[PDB]
Scaffold this active site. Structure first.
Site, PDB file in Angstrom:
ATOM      1  N   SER C  78      33.867  53.483  35.474  1.00 38.42           N
ATOM      2  CA  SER C  78      33.046  52.536  34.895  1.00 38.42           C
ATOM      3  C   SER C  78      31.557  53.208  34.849  1.00 38.42           C
ATOM      4  O   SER C  78      31.152  54.261  34.806  1.00 38.42           O
ATOM      5  CB  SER C  78      33.054  51.007  35.403  1.00 38.42           C
ATOM      6  OG  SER C  78      32.282  50.158  34.617  1.00 38.42           O
ATOM      7  N   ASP C 187      41.552  48.403  27.554  1.00 47.00           N
ATOM      8  CA  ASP C 187      40.520  47.870  28.251  1.00 47.00           C
ATOM      9  C   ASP C 187      39.811  47.057  27.647  1.00 47.00           C
ATOM     10  O   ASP C 187      39.311  47.297  26.447  1.00 47.00           O
ATOM     11  CB  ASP C 187      39.808  49.002  28.593  1.00 47.00           C
ATOM     12  CG  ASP C 187      38.486  48.891  29.715  1.00 47.00           C
ATOM     13  OD1 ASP C 187      38.074  47.786  29.814  1.00 47.00           O
ATOM     14  OD2 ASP C 187      38.378  49.712  30.456  1.00 47.00           O
ATOM     15  N   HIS C 215      40.962  47.728  32.210  1.00 50.47           N
ATOM     16  CA  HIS C 215      39.783  48.376  32.908  1.00 50.47           C
ATOM     17  C   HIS C 215      39.970  48.888  34.371  1.00 50.47           C
ATOM     18  O   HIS C 215      39.407  49.807  34.682  1.00 50.47           O
ATOM     19  CB  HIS C 215      38.432  47.355  32.747  1.00 50.47           C
ATOM     20  CG  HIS C 215      37.118  47.827  33.038  1.00 50.47           C
ATOM     21  ND1 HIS C 215      36.858  49.141  32.402  1.00 50.47           N
ATOM     22  CD2 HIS C 215      36.179  47.721  34.049  1.00 50.47           C
ATOM     23  CE1 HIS C 215      35.600  49.520  33.033  1.00 50.47           C
ATOM     24  NE2 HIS C 215      35.277  48.608  33.544  1.00 50.47           N
TER      25      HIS C 215
END
Lengths: 236, 236, 236, 236
Positions: C78, C187, C215
């Site tokens: 991320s 995601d 995710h």
């Protein structure tokens, strides 16, 4: 001691309950998983299983051999629900509760590969889902390794035997036994509407909904399924 | 694309490699797991398998149908090593590598329940480990659910067929194929010393040691086993 | 010995890689998971982390203390991808490969709760996803227990620090280091089109697609991710 | 609806109960897991927590904010039993049942790393088990990934605060509240014999025994623990 008896659905075997019964053992429950004739590691080819009573024999045999006072809780998956209800009607005094997991629950009184064990001019004797479709329909929410596993254990299902399931006369004695239906919410094979209809036509004592389960709750959500079973048992 | 062929051991079937081949899929490999005759979901009763060639048919058949240029990597477990060595001799040109996982690897040129399928006065036709001993001997380091899984899948092994395994004439062509032995260190069934002894008597190209594996590396340490296979592949 | 270094994303900590490094450990790799400042069990409140270099202190310190010849493989998730790129620019000689798992990878040269540690008239100092939304956006394909786990560990992320991430002068030396992007296909937070754009704007050495990942790949598809990392390692 | 309140032990946090509360959720219970001061993701350094009531603040505050009629079932682990007993005496009216999992339960009326936050001539302010010993003592029967998880979440414990726990005057009102002790059978830290002694000195309403649990039942045998809790609730 509370005793569970697990009845698999078409093409599956006792092997599919491996995650679930392991938990129940640890919780101090006894579980028995059967191979219906032609399923699991049964030596009999399902293509020569033409009868409902022949398919269910290992289950019926098991219920017969129970000591005079012992009772069990029947748990059926999918078409196994038919065998559970039939067993519910022949061994009523020995069943304390019947649980239907995404299963055929019909009140007494109510893409595929084919095998032609009697030639092509006769109707098919065995049915099996094609390998490329099993993930989507059976195991859409399940770990990939369980798909691999299933792909090496799935056997053709005895079509002829399925035509006789749930052709039963009304049974007022079996109505007294508490039933539990457990619904699979993300089931691509046994649609939510079709499940709701079974419930509506024959309302069970308890109803649970596995929000995250595909058709194979015993692979995709075993711990949650485990919890619901203990909860349904707390009822007695 | 590199193609692995997995050969289970006594009483087991293709189903036992379910964790391992799934990893290998993610790694861009193709795997095929066979059910030897009378094993897995084979429709044939192992008690009528008296012959080595009869036991190995599913494996020998698979190697025959391989395209003219295609080669595979053979992986055998336990007594399955015997089938591997034999297949190594009959299909030498089709094997790029033979891997022995806690398996019988013998150079070409070198507690139990019994079943009596030919009556009790003849020698036994099938052998199977008693249920109360499988955890300790097969799965002492394995997840409990894999024990449960195995208990509903283990089938008696064809004793008679095993008597003919590894009685092979010297094969200088088979000597040319690179071998790998993978030793299981906490194996309660195939003692560590005997494994060392097999390695010494016929030294492989490589030696790996799974320090934490019981007899069933594919249940107890599948990810480590996976890694070692990748390392063994890095050579050719 | 190959050494992995894991850098979490916003609100997370070292704890989130617990499934992955355990697998990697067993495969004979070394892994280090850091808590960036204000994350995990860092004693510092993230609302007082106003600086990119302050947030990255634990990561930068670890790379600094590295022996003269030792290299590591950076893996970022991320927003952690930004830290990876930044560390790639400050310690190029010590990075053998940088991996971006659903992470921001931007070439050098290119619903929420807010906390106001400096009053409401100043810009916010901390950001944290509302509890009712973490399952859907972060963990939509992940085990429920991991959602529970996360709910007791997620801490507000230092917004002020995030504004300086990926504001870097061009670095031709960092360009020589092989990068790998792993796209998460399901995601709900970091959309597919946005991932493709990062790939289009700065093409990596390799591209992996976790067809089944949300995710949080390290929770939802850990073994598959594990396999992909070994593959990326197979190159260099 | 029945509300569980979970109290971790030394060095642990709310995070350690993640598997268990997830099960209880599935059984339709509400659970709250607290971080005692200086534990879990508490912003306060435990080396400055010298006081018992400061350590117990998150727990006491939670019991304070309970609506006038609402009760909870207290569940403490290890040293958390001290906080439980203490909370049992101070908020008796708000506790329906107190459960002790391998915990210190003392009737009212009765290898390590050290941190020196006040210099070396003063007694230590924090205690933490050395990394190389946590597997054996805490998690000897737990999955390896939970060891990894713990290793990134364990924090030094406030030694000073522990000296004041369970120094309570006799409480005849608290004696009326039903207690449950759950013994861990394979606990390398709190030996089986010592646990028996607590039961002897202050007999509980119920006694359960986790035959296969290490010190960390919530990691090693969560479903079994789950079942015993359901049994304990059955006592109403």
């Amino acid at each position: 001691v509370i005793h569970f008896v697990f009845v698999h659905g078409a093409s599956h075997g006792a092997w599919c309950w491996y995650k679930l019964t392991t938990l129940l053992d640890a919780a101090g429950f006894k579980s028995t998983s059967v191979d219906l004739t032609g399923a699991g590691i049964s030596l009999i080819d399902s293509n020569i299983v033409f009868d409902s009573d022949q398919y269910n024999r290992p289950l019926f045999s098991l219920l017969s051999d129970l000591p005079p006072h012992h009772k069990v809780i029947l748990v059926g998956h999918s078409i196994g629900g038919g065998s559970v209800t039939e067993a519910l009607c022949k061994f009523t005094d020995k069943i304390s509760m019947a649980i239907y997991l995404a299963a055929s629950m019909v009140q007494p009184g109510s893409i595929w590969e084919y095998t032609y064990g009697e030639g092509t001019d006769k109707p098919p004797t065995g049915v099996l889902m094609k390998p490329e479709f099993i993930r989507h329909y059976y195991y859409s929410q399940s770990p990939l390794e369980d798909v691999t596993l299933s792909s090496k254990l799935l056997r053709p299902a005895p079509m002829r035997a399925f035509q006789d399931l749930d052709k039963l006369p009304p049974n007022p004695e079996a109505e007294k036994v508490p039933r539990v239906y457990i619904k699979t919410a993300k089931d691509n094979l046994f649609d939510s509407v079709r499940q709701d209809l079974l419930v509506e036509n024959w309302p069970p004592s308890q109803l649970y909904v596995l929000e995250d389960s595909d058709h194979s709750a015993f692979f995709s959500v075993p711990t949650t399924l485990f919890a619901y079973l203990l909860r349904a048992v707390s009822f007695l």
